[PDB]
Write a protein that binds this ligand. Sequence first.
Ligand SMILES: *c1cc(-c2ccccc2)ncn1
Ligand SMILES: *c1cc(-c2ccccc2)ncn1
Ligand SMILES: *c1cc(-c2ccccc2)ncn1
Ligand SMILES: [Cl-]
Ligand SMILES: [Cl-]
Ligand SMILES: [Cl-]
Lengths: 117, 117, 117
Amino acid sequence: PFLELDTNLPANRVPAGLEKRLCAAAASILGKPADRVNVTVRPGLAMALSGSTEPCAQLSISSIGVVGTAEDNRSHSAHFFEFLTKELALGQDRILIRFFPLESWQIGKIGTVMTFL
Amino acid sequence: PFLELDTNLPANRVPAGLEKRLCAAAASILGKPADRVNVTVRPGLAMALSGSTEPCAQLSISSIGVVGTAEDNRSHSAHFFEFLTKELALGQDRILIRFFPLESWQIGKIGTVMTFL
Amino acid sequence: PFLELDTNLPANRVPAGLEKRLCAAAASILGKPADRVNVTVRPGLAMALSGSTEPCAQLSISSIGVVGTAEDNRSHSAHFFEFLTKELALGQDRILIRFFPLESWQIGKIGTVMTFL
Ligand SMILES: *c1cc(-c2ccccc2)ncn1
Ligand SMILES: *c1cc(-c2ccccc2)ncn1
Ligand SMILES: *c1cc(-c2ccccc2)ncn1
Ligand SMILES: [Cl-]
Ligand SMILES: [Cl-]
Ligand SMILES: [Cl-]
């Protein structure tokens, strides 16, 4: 899966090693191998979340198969909120998530697409 | 709604308070409560827009219900171009927008998804 | 088309002029005019790709008409991997691509949407 985290926390307020811990967390939550998880963190941005510029974060999760239902995504959301609230020292009111199903023809890897792998 | 603005303007050429003014603008344009609008600004990037690296900006707008039609999006576009051209001191040739409908099962909030709220 | 490149290479390890060379490359690969290509590069990020924080890059390509099939996207992927591996001095294991079809009603330009242009 592809996880992207935008935050207005400066880089020096994002704990060292977050991106690797988020790989491990996502592996467990989403039922994916940790060595296939992708994480991108973009800190130091200018953000408002629900109208407020206090510290916040926006997570996007794009994945094959597992992020397409409300019932599944409810579960995923609970677990990612637990992870991020504690890691980033943010309240639950300061994080939102978006879930994006992907299909194999959308993922370019090793010079082809996943459809053929 | 979720608004994301990438620009090659350095942070010191993006007017102070833009993210909050964009919340207010988006609320009016999209018919959404200002206290529910989300804005992310990512300045200082390396960008070409229509082949040119002159100052530019890319806006993405993701929302439930209101960004799914050409006729609606035409209107939204006109209003967001008015806002951003003046705020960023950019010509209309230096901004593009993408519109992304979302469904409630895609939005993780307070440890669940919007489907259940 | 809209090309977005996230990398944990610092800006000073992304070759000068990349964004314009990527416009030219994308024009040839995707069959689009170079003067209509859009590129956004976001360097210096904190990233893991396939669980590893070694240098890597994530490309997203969003376009009308040409990024909707596996067979097409296979070809596009091969060419973009050739371009980026050499430009960024990255192995093929350190790049992934996502392809996103767009429709004309999603693209805001000059205060309207492409549907009406
Ligand atoms: C997340 C996971 C994967 C992946 C690829 C192959 C096998 C399992 C999982 N790819 C992209 N994003
Ligand atoms: C934009 C707006 C909202 C929102 C949520 C509840 C009620 C109104 C609007 N959520 C996300 N992005
Ligand atoms: C990529 C290309 C274009 C474009 C627009 C008009 C004519 C050809 C191509 N727009 C956005 N992204
Ligand atoms: Cl996946
Ligand atoms: Cl919304
Ligand atoms: Cl296009």
